[PDB]
Short mmCIF file of C-alpha atoms in Angstrom, two decimals:
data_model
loop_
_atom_site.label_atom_id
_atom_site.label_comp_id
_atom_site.label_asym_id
_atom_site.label_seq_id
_atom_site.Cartn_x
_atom_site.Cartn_y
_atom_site.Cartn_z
CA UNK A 1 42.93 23.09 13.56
CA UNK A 2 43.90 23.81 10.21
CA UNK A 3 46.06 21.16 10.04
CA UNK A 4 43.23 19.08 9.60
CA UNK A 5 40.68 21.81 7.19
CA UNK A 6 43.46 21.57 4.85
CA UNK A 7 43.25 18.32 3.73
CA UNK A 8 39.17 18.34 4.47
CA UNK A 9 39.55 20.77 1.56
CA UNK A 10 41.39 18.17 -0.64
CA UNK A 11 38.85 15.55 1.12
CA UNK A 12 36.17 17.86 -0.42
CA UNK A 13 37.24 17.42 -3.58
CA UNK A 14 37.67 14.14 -3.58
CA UNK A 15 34.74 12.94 -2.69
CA UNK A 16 32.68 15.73 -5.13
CA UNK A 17 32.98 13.13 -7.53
CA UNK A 18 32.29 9.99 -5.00
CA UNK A 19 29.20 11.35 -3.12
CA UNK A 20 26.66 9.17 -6.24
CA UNK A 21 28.47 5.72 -6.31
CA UNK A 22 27.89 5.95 -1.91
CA UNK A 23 24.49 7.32 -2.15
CA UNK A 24 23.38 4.72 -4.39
CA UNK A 25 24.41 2.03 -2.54
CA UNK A 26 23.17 3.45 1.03
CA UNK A 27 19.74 3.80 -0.56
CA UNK A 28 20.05 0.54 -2.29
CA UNK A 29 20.71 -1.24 1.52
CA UNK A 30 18.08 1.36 3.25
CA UNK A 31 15.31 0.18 0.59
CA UNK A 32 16.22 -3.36 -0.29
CA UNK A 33 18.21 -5.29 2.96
CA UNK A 34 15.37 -4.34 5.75
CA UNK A 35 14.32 -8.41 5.83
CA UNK A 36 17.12 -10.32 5.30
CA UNK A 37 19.61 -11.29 7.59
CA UNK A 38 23.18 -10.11 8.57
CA UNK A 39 25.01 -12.29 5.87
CA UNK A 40 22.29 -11.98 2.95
CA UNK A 41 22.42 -8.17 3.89
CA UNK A 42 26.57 -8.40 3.03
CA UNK A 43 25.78 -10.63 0.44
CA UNK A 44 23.98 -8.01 -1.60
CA UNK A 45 25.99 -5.08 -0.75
CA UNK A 46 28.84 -6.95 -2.15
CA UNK A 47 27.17 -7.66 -5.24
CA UNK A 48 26.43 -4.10 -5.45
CA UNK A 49 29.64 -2.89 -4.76
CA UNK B 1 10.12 -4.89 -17.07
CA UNK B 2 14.03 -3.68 -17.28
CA UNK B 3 12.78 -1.17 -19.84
CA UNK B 4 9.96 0.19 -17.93
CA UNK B 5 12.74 0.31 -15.15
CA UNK B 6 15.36 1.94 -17.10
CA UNK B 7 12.52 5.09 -17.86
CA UNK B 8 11.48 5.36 -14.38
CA UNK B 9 14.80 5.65 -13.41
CA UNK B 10 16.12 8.04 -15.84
CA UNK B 11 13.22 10.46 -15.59
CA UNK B 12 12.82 10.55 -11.63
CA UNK B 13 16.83 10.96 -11.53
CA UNK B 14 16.65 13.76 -14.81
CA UNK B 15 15.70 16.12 -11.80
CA UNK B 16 18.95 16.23 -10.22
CA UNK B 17 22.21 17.30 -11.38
CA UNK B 18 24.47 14.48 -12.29
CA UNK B 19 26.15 14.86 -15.65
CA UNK B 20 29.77 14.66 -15.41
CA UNK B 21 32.34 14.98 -18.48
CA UNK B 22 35.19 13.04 -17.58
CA UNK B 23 33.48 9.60 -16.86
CA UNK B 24 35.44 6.74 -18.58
CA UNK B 25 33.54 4.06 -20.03
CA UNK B 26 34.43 0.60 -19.42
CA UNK B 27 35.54 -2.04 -21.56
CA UNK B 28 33.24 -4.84 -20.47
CA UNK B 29 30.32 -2.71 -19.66
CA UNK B 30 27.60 -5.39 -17.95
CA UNK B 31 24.65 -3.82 -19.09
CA UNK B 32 21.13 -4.75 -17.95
CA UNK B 33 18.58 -2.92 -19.87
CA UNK B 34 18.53 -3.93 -23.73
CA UNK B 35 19.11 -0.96 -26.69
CA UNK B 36 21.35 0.63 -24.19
CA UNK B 37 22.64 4.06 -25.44
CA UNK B 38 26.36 3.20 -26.50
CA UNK B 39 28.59 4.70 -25.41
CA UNK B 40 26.33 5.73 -22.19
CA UNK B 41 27.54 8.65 -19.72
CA UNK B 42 27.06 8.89 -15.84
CA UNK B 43 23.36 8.85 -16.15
CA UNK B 44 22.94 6.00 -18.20
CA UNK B 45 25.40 3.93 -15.80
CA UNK B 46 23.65 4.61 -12.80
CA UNK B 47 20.22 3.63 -13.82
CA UNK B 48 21.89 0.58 -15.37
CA UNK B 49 23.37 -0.23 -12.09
CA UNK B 50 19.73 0.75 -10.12
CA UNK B 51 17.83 -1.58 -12.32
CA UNK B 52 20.93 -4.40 -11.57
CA UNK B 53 20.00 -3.71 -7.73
CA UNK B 54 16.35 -4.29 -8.32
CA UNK B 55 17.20 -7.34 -10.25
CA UNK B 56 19.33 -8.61 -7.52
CA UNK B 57 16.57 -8.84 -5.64
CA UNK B 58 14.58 -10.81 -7.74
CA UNK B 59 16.96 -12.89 -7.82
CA UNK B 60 18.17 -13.10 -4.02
CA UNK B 61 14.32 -14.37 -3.83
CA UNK B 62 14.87 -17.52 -5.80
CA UNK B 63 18.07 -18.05 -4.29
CA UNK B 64 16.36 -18.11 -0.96
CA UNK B 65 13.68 -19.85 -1.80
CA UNK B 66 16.06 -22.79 -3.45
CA UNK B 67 16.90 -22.61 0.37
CA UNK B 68 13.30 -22.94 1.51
CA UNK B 69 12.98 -19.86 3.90
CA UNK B 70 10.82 -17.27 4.22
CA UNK B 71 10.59 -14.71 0.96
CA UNK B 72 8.82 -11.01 0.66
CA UNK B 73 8.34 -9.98 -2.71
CA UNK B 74 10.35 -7.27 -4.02
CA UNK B 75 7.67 -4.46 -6.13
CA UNK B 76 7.51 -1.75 -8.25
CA UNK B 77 7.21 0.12 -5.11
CA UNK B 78 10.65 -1.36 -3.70
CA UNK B 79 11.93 0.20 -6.10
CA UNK B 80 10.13 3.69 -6.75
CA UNK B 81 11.22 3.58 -2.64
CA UNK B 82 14.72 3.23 -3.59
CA UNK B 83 15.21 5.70 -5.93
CA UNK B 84 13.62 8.15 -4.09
CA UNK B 85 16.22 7.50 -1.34
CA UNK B 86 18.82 7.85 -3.80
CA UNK B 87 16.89 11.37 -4.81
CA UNK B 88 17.48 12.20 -1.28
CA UNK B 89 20.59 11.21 0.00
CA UNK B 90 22.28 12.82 -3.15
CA UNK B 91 20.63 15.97 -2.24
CA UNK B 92 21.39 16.21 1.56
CA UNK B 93 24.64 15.32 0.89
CA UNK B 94 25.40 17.42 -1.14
CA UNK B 95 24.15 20.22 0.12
CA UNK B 96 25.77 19.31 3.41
CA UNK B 97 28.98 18.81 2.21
#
């Protein structure tokens, strides 16, 4: 097992400085892409991204 | 109005801790709101790229509507709802992780 919590350590710090950029765009789709349709939905999470 | 965007945004997301001092600043910058702060740090960014989302959907209207299907109108409450699920996701995650 700590073959793997090592690098979820590394992981952890990583992603300290990722966690906004993801959050922003999973409250951007949970707010925004409710009506649209599959492709409109990937449509405007690519434009995000 | 972008402006009246760019304050919401910056004071509902002053709240939270997000400064961060090594942020590079791009070259090409798109900005959205007007008399943005140059050169802008984390905070500034974001909100830029919050009121781009909210603008995206004013404009994924007319492009659907070019179309001639069905359009809901996208409100200041869209997007006081999104940034309070960017308030909150930032949070839990954090605090989970």
């Amino acid at each position: 097992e700590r073959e793997r919590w090592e690098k979820t350590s590394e992981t952890f710090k990583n992603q300290m400085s990722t966690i906004a950029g993801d959050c922003l765009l999973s409250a951007a789709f949970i707010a925004y892409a409710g009506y649209f349709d599959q492709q409109m939905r990937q449509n405007l999470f690519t434009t995000w991204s | 109005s972008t402006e009246a965007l760019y304050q919401v945004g910056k004071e509902f997301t002053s709240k939270m801790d997000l400064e961060k001092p090594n942020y590079i600043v791009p070259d090409y910058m798109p900005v959205v709101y007007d008399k943005l702060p140059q050169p802008p740090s984390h905070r500034e960014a974001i909100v830029n790229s919050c009121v781009f989302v909210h603008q995206t959907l004013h404009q994924a209207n007319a492009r659907l509507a070019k179309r001639g299907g069905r359009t809901m109108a996208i409100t200041p409450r869209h997007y006081l709802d999104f940034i309070n699920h960017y308030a909150n996701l930032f949070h839990e995650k954090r605090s989970e992780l």
